[PDB]
């Protein structure tokens, strides 16, 4: 036939307009298409092409030309495929019924898609991810009232209104509309939509009307969360009678939660609302079919109530961040046969844990309940019950006294634990090291004594080790030196000893190592310069001496920063207290509330400039030492020029040890840096010059040492008080006494 000849050579001439032609390698003339990768074909005819994920780096023009207009063709998937420009007039296929565009950088006013209704037979059209917006007045319509799914989400779209504009003409048809994460404001109406399952108008602009459903007769998942909506959003859904999702989490409601439509709901958010009052008896109305609970992050308050019993198919419940109170309400949580994920975390439950929660070990994914302020010991019988599923605890920021039961070594699916900010006493029990899928192990702030468990060695996972302030003792295992996975090492504020080991390179995966305030000794290893993901040393008070190696700056230039996304706390040191040493301590923060900080007061010695955040580098690839805090040590003799050598560095802190020779002119290289202090030391001669292209400086300190001559007049020293300059005899010009 001709429309065989013509597939052929419709499909190749793509091909050859392809930047990377090497793409479709087996596509070729003379050859059948059937055989082609990327091809569907049912009785030797072309049915769909995949070219998803593939980088064609093409114009919509080309797809429109080469494959829209192919005989036959009923469905073409193009997601995230680096297909650009705009859609526009064209030739369509009347048997083309799904369309898949997502994930590409399509543009233009989204009114270029009424030009799909070429398309006669289209029913699923997918243009989510691209940058399509509406350029001022909403007028006219879309015109593809024969779309069953529209997916317009993660677009540009910003304008009033312009649901109705996607309505306009008629949605009989429409099933599934979702237009999230747009700057989309106004009315929307989709009463006359009569058939629609599913709406997502979520992460929008919507700040007025409250979408109106009308018989709401077919809605089953409906999602308006992530607005700044508030009102009767219970009478809008009342007749909602097959709803199975309501999402309606980050916005603006307020009062109690009202009347809801419960024999079809299978999930809930009110999450991020203004909610008050107690959780309503009603609700055990949703018993038989809930699944999902989500009511964090509100101000409700009083009990768990007992009816959740019946709701034996819950399988994750979340009440974090409102004011619940009283015990572990165990009776009501034992019933839930089908619970998975249990989240407390941040309210004012209290009392010791109940025996019985040994049962749910066998049950549950996660037990959080963090930020409570439970008391007693953690249940040595936790994890009994053979075939223990738990795969993450969370106890931290609570009042847990005791023991660190060895006993968790039986949970053995356990990924995550956090037993940080409690007052438990004993050691690290070495049968941790059974835990062999465990990831992060957070236990700082109690009163743990002891060594760090060699047996650590084998738990090959781990990922992070967060010790900070307790009361540890002996030194740095060798046995760390298996866990090869290791990127947070935070150890400060124990009493531990020797030396940093030369096994440290090896772990090629470590962004982050804290030692500060303890006894470690001898000389800085030059193998710290062979961790190619080093971003953040902190080594503040110690005995540390030797030189400084040179070899440790080697990696700059070349790192790329698996660390992002934790909760963290950078807690910065005022000058104002000589006990308190060092830039800052930055601070592992999940589940942990900040007005708990209160608590490090026993522990140390610094007053109150806080820095939240989750952790996030700025490069991404080929950056450098972003801290390096080594002050108030023993070292000695010359700063190395490769000091210079690192753009990323922020903070600079090798104050109070015994450097001497002059500052290399390498630090005016230093164009990220924000802090350098070098106060207190030996060094000798003049302030480079160089060092007045530096433009980021918010604090410098180069008091006590023997520096010479005039302070730089250009640049950011003008800036800074004397105090910063102090005691250095030879030292002059503003803004000290000008030079003789
Ligand atoms: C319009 O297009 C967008 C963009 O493609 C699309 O959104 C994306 O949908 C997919 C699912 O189709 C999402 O990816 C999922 O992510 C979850 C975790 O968040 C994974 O568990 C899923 O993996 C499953 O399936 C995989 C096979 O593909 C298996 O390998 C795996 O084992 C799992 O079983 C799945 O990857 C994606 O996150 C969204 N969001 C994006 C990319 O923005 C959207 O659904 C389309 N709209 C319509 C109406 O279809
Ligand atoms: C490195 O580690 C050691 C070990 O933590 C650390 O020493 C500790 O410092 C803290 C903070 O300065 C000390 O806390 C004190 O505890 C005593 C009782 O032992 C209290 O009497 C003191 O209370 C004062 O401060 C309170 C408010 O913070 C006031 O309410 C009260 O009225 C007092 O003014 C004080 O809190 C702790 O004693 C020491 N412990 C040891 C072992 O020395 C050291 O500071 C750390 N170094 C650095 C640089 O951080
Ligand atoms: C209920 O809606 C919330 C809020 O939109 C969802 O949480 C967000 O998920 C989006 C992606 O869809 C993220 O970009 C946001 O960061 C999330 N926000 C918050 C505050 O968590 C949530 O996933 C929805 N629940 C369900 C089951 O769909
Ligand atoms: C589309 O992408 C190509 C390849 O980078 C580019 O050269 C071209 O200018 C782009 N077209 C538009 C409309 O920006
Ligand atoms: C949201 O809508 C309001 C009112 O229409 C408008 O003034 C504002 O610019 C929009 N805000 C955003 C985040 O675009
Ligand atoms: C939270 O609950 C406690 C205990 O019932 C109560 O005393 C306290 O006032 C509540 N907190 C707030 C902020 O209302």
């Not at 399509?132 to 779209?157: C, Q, R, T």
Request: aromatic share 8%; with cysteine.
């Amino acid at each position: 036939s001709q429309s065989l000849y013509r597939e052929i050579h419709q499909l190749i001439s793509f091909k050859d307009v392809l930047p990377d032609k090497n793409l479709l390698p087996d596509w070729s003339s003379n050859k059948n298409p059937c055989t082609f990768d990327g091809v569907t074909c049912r009785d030797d005819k072309v049915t769909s092409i995949d070219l998803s994920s593939k980088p064609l780096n093409v114009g919509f023009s080309a797809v429109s030309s080469s494959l829209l207009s192919l005989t036959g063709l009923e469905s073409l998937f193009l997601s995230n495929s680096h297909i650009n420009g705009s859609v526009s007039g064209f030739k369509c296929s009347a048997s083309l019924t799904s369309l898949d565009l997502s994930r590409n950088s399509l543009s233009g006013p989204v009114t270029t898609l009424t030009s799909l209704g070429s398309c006669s037979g289209l029913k699923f059209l997918n243009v989510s991810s691209n940058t399509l917006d509406f350029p001022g007045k909403v007028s006219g319509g879309l015109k593809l009232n024969s779309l069953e799914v529209l997916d317009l989400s993660a677009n540009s779209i910003s304008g009033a209104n312009v649901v109705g504009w996607v309505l306009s003409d008629g949605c009989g048809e429409l099933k599934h509309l979702a237009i999230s994460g747009n700057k989309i404001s106004g009315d929307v109406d989709v009463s006359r939509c009569v058939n629609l399952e599913f709406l997502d108008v979520s992460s929008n602009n919507f700040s007025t009307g409250i979408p109106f459903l009308g018989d709401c007769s077919a809605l089953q998942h409906l999602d308006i969360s992530g607005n700044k909506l508030s009102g009767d959003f219970s009478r809008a859904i009342s007749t909602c009678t097959e709803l199975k999702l309501l999402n309606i989490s980050s916005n603006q409601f307020v009062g109690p939660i009202p009347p809801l439509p419960l024999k079809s709901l299978q999930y809930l958010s009110l999450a991020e609302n203004k909610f008050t009052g107690e959780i309503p008896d009603f609700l055990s109305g949703a018993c038989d079919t809930l699944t999902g609970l989500d009511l964090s992050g509100n101000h409700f308050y009083g009990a768990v109530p007992p009816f959740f019993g019946s709701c034996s198919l819950l399988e994750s419940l979340a009440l974090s961040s409102n004011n619940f109170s009283g015990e572990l309400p165990m009776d009501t949580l034992l019933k839930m046969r089908g619970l998975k994920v249990l989240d407390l975390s941040f309210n004012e439950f209290s009392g010791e844990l109940p025996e019985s929660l040994t049962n749910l070990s066998a049950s549950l994914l996660t037990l959080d309940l963090s930020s409570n302020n439970f008391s007693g010991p953690i249940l040595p019988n936790l994890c009994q019950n053979p075939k223990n599923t738990l795969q993450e605890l969370y106890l931290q920021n609570n009042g847990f006294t005791g023991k660190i039961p060895p006993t968790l070594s039986n949970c053995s699916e356990l990924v995550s634990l956090h037993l940080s900010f409690n007052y438990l006493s004993g050691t690290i029990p070495s049968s941790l090291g059974s835990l062999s899928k465990l990831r992060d192990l957070k236990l700082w702030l109690n009163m743990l004594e002891g060594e760090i468990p060699q047996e650590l060695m084998y738990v090959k996972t781990l990922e992070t080790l967060i010790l900070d302030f307790n009361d540890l003792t002996g030194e740095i295992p060798s046995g760390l030196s298996n866990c090869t996975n290791l990127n947070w090492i935070s150890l400060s504020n124990n009493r531990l000893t020797g030396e940093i080991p030369k096994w440290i390179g090896r772990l090629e995966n470590l962004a982050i190592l804290k030692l500060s305030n303890n006894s470690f000794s001898g000389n800085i290893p030059a193998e710290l310069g062979d961790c190619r993901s080093l971003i953040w040393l902190d080594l503040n008070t110690n005995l540390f001496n030797g030189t400084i190696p040179a070899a440790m700056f080697k990696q700059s230039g070349k790192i790329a920063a698996f660390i992002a996304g934790k909760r963290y706390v950078y807690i910065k040191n005022d000058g104002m207290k000589k006990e308190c040493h060092g830039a800052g301590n930055l601070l592992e923060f999940q589940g942990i509330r900040s007005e708990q900080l209160n608590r490090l007061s026993t522990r140390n010695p610094c007053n109150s400039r806080v820095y939240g955040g989750h952790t996030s580098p700025t490069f991404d690839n080929n950056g450098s030492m972003m801290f390096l805090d080594m002050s108030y040590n023993m070292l000695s003799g010359y700063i190395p020029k490769e000091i210079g050598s690192m753009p990323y560095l922020f903070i600079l802190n090798l104050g109070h040890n015994d450097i001497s020779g002059s500052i290399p002119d390498e630090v005016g290289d230093l164009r990220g840096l924000n802090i350098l202090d070098l106060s207190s030391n030996k060094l000798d001669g003049r302030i480079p010059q160089a060092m007045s292209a530096l433009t980021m400086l918010t604090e410098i300190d180069l008091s006590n040492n023997n520096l010479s001559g005039p302070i730089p007049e250009m640049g950011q020293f003008e800036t800074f008080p004397p105090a910063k300059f102090l005691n250095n005899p030879g030292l002059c010009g503003y803004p000290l006494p000008r030079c003789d």
